[PDB]
Amino acid sequence: MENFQKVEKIGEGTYGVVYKARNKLTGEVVALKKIPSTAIREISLLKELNHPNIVKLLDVIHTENKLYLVFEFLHQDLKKFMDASALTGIPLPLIKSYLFQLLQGLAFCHSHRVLHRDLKPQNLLINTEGAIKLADFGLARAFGVPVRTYTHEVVTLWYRAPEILLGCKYYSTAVDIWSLGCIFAEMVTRRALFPGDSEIDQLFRIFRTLGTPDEVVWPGVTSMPDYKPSFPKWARQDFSKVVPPLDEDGRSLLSQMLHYDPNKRISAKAALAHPFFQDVTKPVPHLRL
Numbered sequence: 001m002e003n004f005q006k007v008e009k010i011g012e013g014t015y016g017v018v019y020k021a022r023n024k025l026t027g028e029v030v031a032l033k034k035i036p037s038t039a040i041r042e043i044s045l046l047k048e049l050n051h052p053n054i055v056k057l058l059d060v061i062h063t064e065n066k067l068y069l070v071f072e073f074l075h076q077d078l079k080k081f082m083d084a085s086a087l088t089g090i091p092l093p094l095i096k097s098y099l100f101q102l103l104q105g106l107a108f109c110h111s112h113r114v115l116h117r118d119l120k121p122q123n124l125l126i127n128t129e130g131a132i133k134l135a136d137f138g139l140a141r142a143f144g145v146p147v148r149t150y151t152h153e154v155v156t157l158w159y160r161a162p163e164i165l166l167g168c169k170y171y172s173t174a175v176d177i178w179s180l181g182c183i184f185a186e187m188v189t190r191r192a193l194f195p196g197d198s199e200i201d202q203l204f205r206i207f208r209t210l211g212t213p214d215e216v217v218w219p220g221v222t223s224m225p226d227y228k229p230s231f232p233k234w235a236r237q238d239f240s241k242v243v244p245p246l247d248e249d250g251r252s253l254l255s256q257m258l259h260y261d262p263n264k265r266i267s268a269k270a271a272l273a274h275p276f277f278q279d280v281t282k283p284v285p286h287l288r289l
């Protein structure tokens, strides 16, 4: 760490505080994240998982039994950008470009059997060139996913897939497609899709919009560990009501990204081929740094 000069704190991640820092030598500006052999090995694997839509893991510093992860620095996150674009909303072509890029990032990670597991606007980082990138990829498998960050800040449930909430132990890459569908809806409507404030409130918000899942739409759901026959039975709502005024192509894709059955939920690779992206472009966001 003597090689870095902390410039400022840019947030408190799930596994520790993140600082903007400068390499005392190269002068390179980076994000320094202050955090077992298994964890060390897993994190080490992440260094090779490189893609233009995945925030680059530059190095890992393991000292005094303390862990620091050195990342590429980006100037803004999607949560801030959305708050800033609240009055007018993010233009559709930009939402479309961001979604397309994030799907490319996911398709890449998923091909290497690596899941993110905790996608949320705070871990989607953007630059002036119109790129968006996934931050903290793989850290959940490496260290695990807690309920409260080292800062005691409640870990958001808003983007959690229903199979996780229902106790599935061996969930899949489909969990990241669910999260991204939630974020896609939020960019379009300017409001979180399922802002649950407890595990049961999160599940019930999902059920109220998508209908209470049953064996018809999700074979095996009633056997899941945390499924209860006493759950209320709510009817499904039309997506025309959920994400107006998204067009039919967007509503169709969002529907496949929010399918209950993880086996049937669209993959990142298949989503890239969806008609919604026929006219995709790469606009530049107007960032105020």
Ligand SMILES: Cc1cnc2c(NCc3ccncc3)nccn12
Pocket: 009, 010, 011, 018, 020, 031, 055, 071, 072, 073, 074, 075, 076, 077, 125, 135
């Ligand atoms: C791993 C990582 C790389 N860049 C960021 C990042 N950048 C946004 C920002 C920049 C400056 N001040 C506040 C937030 N936020 C969180 C994590 N980050």
